[PDB]
Amino acid sequence: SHVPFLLIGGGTAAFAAARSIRARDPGARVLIVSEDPELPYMRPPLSKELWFSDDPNVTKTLQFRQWNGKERSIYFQPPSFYVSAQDLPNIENGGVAVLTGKKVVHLDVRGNMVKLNDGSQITFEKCLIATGGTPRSLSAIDRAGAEVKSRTTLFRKIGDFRALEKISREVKSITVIGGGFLGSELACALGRKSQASGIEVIQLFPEKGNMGKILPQYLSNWTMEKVKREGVKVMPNAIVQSVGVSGGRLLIKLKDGRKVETDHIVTAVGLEPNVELAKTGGLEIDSDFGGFRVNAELQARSNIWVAGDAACFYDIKLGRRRVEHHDHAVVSGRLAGENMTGAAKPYWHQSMFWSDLGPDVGYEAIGLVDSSLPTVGVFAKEDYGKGVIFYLRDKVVVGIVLWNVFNRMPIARKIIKDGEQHEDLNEVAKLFNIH
Amino acid sequence: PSHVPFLLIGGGTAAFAAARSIRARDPGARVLIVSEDPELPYMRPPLSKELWFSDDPNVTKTLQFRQWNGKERSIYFQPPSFYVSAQDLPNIENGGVAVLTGKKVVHLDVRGNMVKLNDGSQITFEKCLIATGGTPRSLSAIDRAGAEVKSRTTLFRKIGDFRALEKISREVKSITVIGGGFLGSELACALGRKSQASGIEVIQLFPEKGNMGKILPQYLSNWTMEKVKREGVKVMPNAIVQSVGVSGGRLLIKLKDGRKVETDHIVTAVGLEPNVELAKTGGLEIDSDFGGFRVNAELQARSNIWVAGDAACFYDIKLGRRRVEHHDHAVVSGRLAGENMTGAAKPYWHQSMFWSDLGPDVGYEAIGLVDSSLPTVGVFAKAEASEITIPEDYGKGVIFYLRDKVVVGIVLWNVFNRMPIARKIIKDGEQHEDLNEVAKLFNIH
Numbered sequence: 001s002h003v004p005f006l007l008i009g010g011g012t013a014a015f016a017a018a019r020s021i022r023a024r025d026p027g028a029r030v031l032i033v034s035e036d037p038e039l040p041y042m043r044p045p046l047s048k049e050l051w052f053s054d055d056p057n058v059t060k061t062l063q064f065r066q067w068n069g070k071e072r073s074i075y076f077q078p079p080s081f082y083v084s085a086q087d088l089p090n091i092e093n094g095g096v097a098v099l100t101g102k103k104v105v106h107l108d109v110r111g112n113m114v115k116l117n118d119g120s121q122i123t124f125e126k127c128l129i130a131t132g133g134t135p136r137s138l139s140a141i142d143r144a145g146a147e148v149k150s151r152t153t154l155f156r157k158i159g160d161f162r163a164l165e166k167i168s169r170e171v172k173s174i175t176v177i178g179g180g181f182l183g184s185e186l187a188c189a190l191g192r193k194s195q196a197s198g199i200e201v202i203q204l205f206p207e208k209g210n211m212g213k214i215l216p217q218y219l220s221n222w223t224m225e226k227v228k229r230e231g232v233k234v235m236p237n238a239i240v241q242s243v244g245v246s247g248g249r250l251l252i253k254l255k256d257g258r259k260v261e262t263d264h265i266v267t268a269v270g271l272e273p274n275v276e277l278a279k280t281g282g283l284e285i286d287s288d289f290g291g292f293r294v295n296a297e298l299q300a301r302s303n304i305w306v307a308g309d310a311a312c313f314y315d316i317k318l319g320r321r322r323v324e325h326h327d328h329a330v331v332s333g334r335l336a337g338e339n340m341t342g343a344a345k346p347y348w349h350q351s352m353f354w355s356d357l358g359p360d361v362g363y364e365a366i367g368l369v370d371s372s373l374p375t376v377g378v379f380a381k382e383d384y385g386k387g388v389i390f391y392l393r394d395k396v397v398v399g400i401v402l403w404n405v406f407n408r409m410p411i412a413r414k415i416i417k418d419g420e421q422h423e424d425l426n427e428v429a430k431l432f433n434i435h
Numbered sequence: 436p437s438h439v440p441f442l443l444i445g446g447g448t449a450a451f452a453a454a455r456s457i458r459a460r461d462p463g464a465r466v467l468i469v470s471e472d473p474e475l476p477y478m479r480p481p482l483s484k485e486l487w488f489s490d491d492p493n494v495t496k497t498l499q500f501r502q503w504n505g506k507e508r509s510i511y512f513q514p515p516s517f518y519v520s521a522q523d524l525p526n527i528e529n530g531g532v533a534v535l536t537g538k539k540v541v542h543l544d545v546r547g548n549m550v551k552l553n554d555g556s557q558i559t560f561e562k563c564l565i566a567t568g569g570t571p572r573s574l575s576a577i578d579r580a581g582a583e584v585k586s587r588t589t590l591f592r593k594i595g596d597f598r599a600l601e602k603i604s605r606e607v608k609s610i611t612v613i614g615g616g617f618l619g620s621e622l623a624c625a626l627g628r629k630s631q632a633s634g635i636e637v638i639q640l641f642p643e644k645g646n647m648g649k650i651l652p653q654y655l656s657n658w659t660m661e662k663v664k665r666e667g668v669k670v671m672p673n674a675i676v677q678s679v680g681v682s683g684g685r686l687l688i689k690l691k692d693g694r695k696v697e698t699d700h701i702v703t704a705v706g707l708e709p710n711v712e713l714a715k716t717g718g719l720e721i722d723s724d725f726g727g728f729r730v731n732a733e734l735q736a737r738s739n740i741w742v743a744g745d746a747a748c749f750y751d752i753k754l755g756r757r758r759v760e761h762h763d764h765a766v767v768s769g770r771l772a773g774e775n776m777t778g779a780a781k782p783y784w785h786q787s788m789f790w791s792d793l794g795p796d797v798g799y800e801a802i803g804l805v806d807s808s809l810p811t812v813g814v815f816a817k818a819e820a821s822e823i824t825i826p827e828d829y830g831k832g833v834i835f836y837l838r839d840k841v842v843v844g845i846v847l848w849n850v851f852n853r854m855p856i857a858r859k860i861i862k863d864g865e866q867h868e869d870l871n872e873v874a875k876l877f878n879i880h
C-alpha cells in the first residue's frame with residue numbers, strides 16, 4: 001500500500017499539513033495514519049470552550065461557542081469532508097483520508113516505508129512525522145498500582161475530555177498535576193464548571209507559579225493568582241514522590257511533604273515528543289530539545305519533515321528550538337505541509353500562542369518565551385493587568401508576551417523580527433499602548 | 436548578479452570531492468567553487484610529509500612528491516586545466532567545475548539563494564555546498580606578541596606556509612614546532628629528517644604527553660614520541676607557550692613550565708578553526724559543539740544548502756553527530772554532499788578514515804571514532820579513557836576504540852591492508868566476545 005503524503009499522526013499539525021498540502025496541492029492524497037480512532041480535532045477546546053458551553057449534549061456533539069457566539073465542532077472538519085482510506089488512492093481530486101486506529105511502528109527511512117501495527121506496510125513519498133507527543137506520565141504514577149492508574153489519566157484526547165467531564169459530573173475532586181499550559185487551562189475549565197457543580201479542582205506543579213517555564217517570576221505569580229480566582233486550588237513548588245489509593249480516593253504524596261487527596265488525577269506534566277520512529281528510522285533526535293532534529297524548514301531527511309510538537313527546528317532569528325502549541329502545530333504543520341509541497345520556507349512568521357486563564361488572563365506570546373531568559377516587562381498604569389514582556393538575549397528582544405494587550409501581536413512580531421538593541425524598552429512598550 | 440546551479444564555497448578537498456561527486460551523479464552539472472585562496476584545490480597532506488622527504492632541491496617550487504609506488508604526484512587534486520573558468524561555467528557544454536580563486540564569499544542570502552563576494556558581486560545558486568574548511572588557529576601568545584616575533588612565527592595550512600617554513604629551515608639554526616597533533620608531529624618529523632644533513636635544530640613542543648595525544652592511547656603516543664625524537668627532533672612534550680619575544684636577535688619562547696626555547700623561527704600547528712563566517716548572514720546553524728555548519732546525515736543544512744569537509748558537522752546514523760578534519764573525510768563527505776545535492780538523499784554511511792606517518796617506525800590508519808577520549812583495546816605483535824593491550828614493542832598492532840560494547844573506531848598500527856576488516860567490524864556492531872580473536876583478523880598473532 002502507498003500514499004503520496006503520509007502524515008504520521010492524526011493531529012493538528014497533520015491536519016494543518018493536510019490542509020496546507022491540499023491548499024498548495026489541491027489534488028493531494030494525504031493519508032493521515034492516526035493511531036487514534038478519532039478524526040483530527042483541535043485540542044484547545046478540550047481544555048477550554050467545550051467546558052464553557054451550555055448543553056449537556058456538548059459532550060456528545062463536541063461543539064463549542066467561539067469568541068463571537070458562532071458555534072463549531074472540535075473536529076477540524078465533518079467526517080464527510082474526509083475520504084475513506086480505501087477510497088483515498090482512487091477518489092477524484094484526491095483528499096484526506098484518516099486510517100484511524102492504525103499506528104506506524106517502523107519507519108523505513110531508506111525504503112520510504114512505514115510498517116503499521118497490523119503488520120501492514122505503507123510506502124510514502126513525503127512523510128510528515130506529526131506524531132506530536134504523548135503526555136509524559138509521572139514516574140510516581142507508573143510505579144504505582146493498577147488501581148491508582150485506573151483513576152489517574154493523561155489529557156490529550158476527546159476520550160480524555162469525555163472521561164474527564166463525565167468524571168467532572170461524577171467525582172467531587174479532580175487534581176491537575178502540572179503547572180504549564182494544560183494543567184492551568186484544565187484547572188480553569190474545571191474551575192468554571194465548579195461554579196455550578198461545586199467540584200473540587202486542584203492544580204499542582206514544581207514551579208513557583210503557573211506557566212513557570214514561560215512567564216517571568218512576577219508575572220507567573222500574578223497569573224497563578226488569576227487561576228486561583230477561577231476556582232482552582234493552585235499548589236506551586238510541588239514535586240510528587242508517590243501516588244496510592246486511600247479511602248476509595250487517590251492520595252498524592254509530594255516531596256516537600258504536602259499531600260493531595262483526589263478522586264481523579266490528570267497529569268499534564270509536559271509532553272514527550274513521540275520519537276519512537278527515530279530509532280528504526282535512524283533519525284536524529286535533539287538531545288537538548290527532544291524531538292526529531294529538523295532544520296529551519298522542519299526537515300529531518302529528504303522526505304521526512306516533522307511538524308508540531310515533535311519537531312525540534314532551527315529558528316534563524318532565535319536559534320534551535322521545539323514548540324508545542326496549537327498555532328505552532330498549525331503554523332509548523334502548515335509550514336511543513338507547504339515545505340512538503342516544496343515551499344522551502346524557513347520558519348519565520350512566528351507561531352504564537354494564547355492562553356486564557358479566566359477572564360483577566362488573556363495573553364499572547366511570541367518567540368523565545370522562556371522564563372530562563374532575561375526579561376523586561378512594562379505594564380499599564382503589582383498590577384500586571386496589562387503589559388508587554390520582553391524576553392532578551394544578546395541585548396535584543398527575543399520573545400514577547402502581550403499581556404491582556406489585544407490587537408498588538410503585529411507590533412510584537414515586529415520587535416522580535418527587528419533585533420533592534422533598544423535604547424529604552426519603556427519607549428517600546430508604548431507601541432503596545434502601555435504607558 | 437550571476438547564477439550557478441551548484442555553488443561550492445571554499446576551494447579545498449571537500450569542495451573538490453563534492454564537485455566530482457556532483458559531476459559523477461549529475462553529469463553535465465555546472466559547479467562553481469568560490470575560493471578565497473589564490474591557489475587551486477590541492478591536497479594538504481604532502482605539505483607536512485612527502486614534500487619534505489623529497490631530496491629534490493626544487494620541491495618547494497614543484498609541489499610534487501613520490502607516492503608509495505614511487506610514482507610522482509602533485510599536491511593539486513587535478514591540474515588547473517581540468518577546471519573551467521568562472522566566466523565559462525554558465526555556458527560551457529556539459530558544465531564542469533570553475534574556481535573563483537582569490538574571491539571570498541562574504542554574504543550568503545539563503546532565502547534569495549544568493550551569495551555576495553568580497554568585491555561586491557552577487558551569485559545566485561540552486562544547490563550550494565559550503566566547504567570552507569578551516570583556518571589554522573593561532574596561538575594567542577603569538578597574537579599578543581610584537582611585530583618582529585609575529586613575522587617570525589607562521590601558521591601552517593597552505594602551500595605558502597610550506598615554502599616559507601622550508602626556506603626558513605635552510606636559513607636558521609633552529610625552528611620550533613608548536614603543536615603535537617597531526618601537523619606538528621609530521622612537520623617536526625619532516626624537519627628532523629632535514630636536520631640529519633643540515634644540522635638544524637628541530638624542536639617540537641606541545642601540551643600533550645606525547646605526539647598525537649588527541650587520538651592515540653598514551654602508551655602508543657609515547658612510543659610514537661620516541662620515534663619522533665629518533666627522527667632528530669628535540670621533542671618537548673608537556674609544553675604550553677606563555678610568551679614569545681625576541682632576545683639577542685633570536686626568538687625566545689617562554690613556556691609556562693619555565694623552560695625557554697631559543698630558536699630562530701616558530702610554526703604553530705595548534706588545530707583548525709572551521710570557517711563559518713557565512714552562517715551569520717546565511718542564517719545557517721553552526722554546531723556549537725563540533726564547530727562547523729550543522730547538517731543532517733545527508734550533509735544538508737537547508738533546502739538547497741549542504742556542507743562538507745572540515746566545516747561540516749554532520750549526523751552519522753550509526754556513530755552520531757561529528758565533524759572530521761581529515762583528508763579522506765573531506766573526500767567522503769564532499770562526495771556524499773555532492774551526491775545529495777543531486778537528489779541521492781543518502782546518509783553518511785561509508786566511513787571515512789585517516790592515516791599518519793611519523794618516521795619509518797610509525798605508520799598507521801584509523802577509522803570511526805578515533806579519539807583518545809574513547810576506551811581502546813590494542814593487540815600488538817610479539818617481535819582517563821581505558822587503554823587495554825592484549826599479550827614496549829608497539830611496533831605492530833590494532834587498536835579498537837569502543838563505545839556501547841561495540842567497536843566504533845579502529846587504529847591499525849603498522850598494520851596495513853586491513854582497513855576493510857576494520858570497517859566491517861565498525862559497520863556490524865557485533866559484540867565481540869574476544870578482541871584477540873578479532874585481532875587475529877588483522878594478522879596480529
Ligand SMILES: Cc1cc2nc3c(=O)[nH]c(=O)nc-3n(C[C@H](O)[C@H](O)[C@H](O)COP(=O)(O)OP(=O)(O)OC[C@H]3O[C@@H](n4cnc5c(N)ncnc54)[C@H](O)[C@@H]3O)c2cc1C
Binds near residue numbers: 102155274324326353
Ligand atoms: C487539551 C489541549 C489543549 C490545548 N490548548 C492549546 C491552546 O489553547 N493554545 C495553544 O497554543 N496550544 C494548545 N495546545 C497545544 C496544541 O494542541 C498542540 O501543540 C497540538 O495538538 C500539536 O499537534 P500535533 O499534530 O503536533 O500533535 P498531536 O495533536 O499530538 O497529534 C499527533 C497524533 O499522532 C498520533 N501518533 C503518534 N505516533 C503515531 C504513530 N507512530 N502512528 C500513528 N499515529 C501516531 C497521536 O496519537 C496523535 O493523535 C493544547 C493541547 C491540548 C492537548
Ligand SMILES: Cc1cc2nc3c(=O)[nH]c(=O)nc-3n(C[C@H](O)[C@H](O)[C@H](O)COP(=O)(O)OP(=O)(O)OC[C@H]3O[C@@H](n4cnc5c(N)ncnc54)[C@H](O)[C@@H]3O)c2cc1C
Binds near residue numbers: 469471481539593789
Ligand atoms: C599540512 C597538512 C596536512 C595534512 N595531512 C593529512 C593527512 O595526512 N591525512 C589526513 O587525513 N588529513 C590530513 N590533513 C587534513 C586535510 O587536508 C583536511 O581535512 C582537508 O584539507 C579538509 O578539506 P576541506 O575542503 O574541508 O577544507 P580546506 O582544505 O581548508 O578548504 C577550504 C578552502 O575554502 C576557503 N574558504 C573559506 N571561506 C571561504 C569563503 N567565505 N569564500 C571562499 N572561499 C573560502 C579556504 O581558504 C580554503 O582554501 C592535512 C592538513 C594540512 C594542512
Ligand SMILES: NC(=O)c1ccc[n+]([C@@H]2O[C@H](COP(=O)([O-])OP(=O)(O)OC[C@H]3O[C@@H](n4cnc5c(N)ncnc54)[C@H](O)[C@@H]3O)[C@@H](O)[C@H]2O)c1
Binds near residue numbers: 181207239270
Ligand atoms: N494555551 C496553550 O498554549 C496550551 C493549553 C493547553 C495545552 N497546551 C500544550 O499541551 C501540551 C501538554 O501541556 P502541559 O501543560 O502538560 O506541558 P507544559 O510544557 O506546558 O508544562 C509542563 C509542566 O509540567 C510540570 N512538570 C514537568 N515535569 C514535572 C514533574 N516530573 N513532576 C510534576 N510536574 C512536572 C511543570 O509544571 C511544567 O511547567 C504542551 O505541549 C502544551 O504546550 C498548550
Ligand SMILES: NC(=O)c1ccc[n+]([C@@H]2O[C@H](COP(=O)([O-])OP(=O)(O)OC[C@H]3O[C@@H](n4cnc5c(N)ncnc54)[C@H](O)[C@@H]3O)[C@@H](O)[C@H]2O)c1
Binds near residue numbers: 574618761
Ligand atoms: N595525518 C593527518 O590526518 C594529518 C596530518 C597533518 C595535518 N592534519 C590536519 O590538519 C589540521 C591542523 O592540524 P593540527 O595538528 O594543527 O591540528 P590537530 O587538531 O591535529 O592538533 C591540534 C594540536 O594542537 C596543539 N594545541 C592545541 N591548542 C594548543 C595551544 N593553545 N598551545 C599549544 N599547542 C596547542 C595540541 O598538540 C593539539 O594536539 C587538522 O584538521 C588535522 O586533522 C592531519
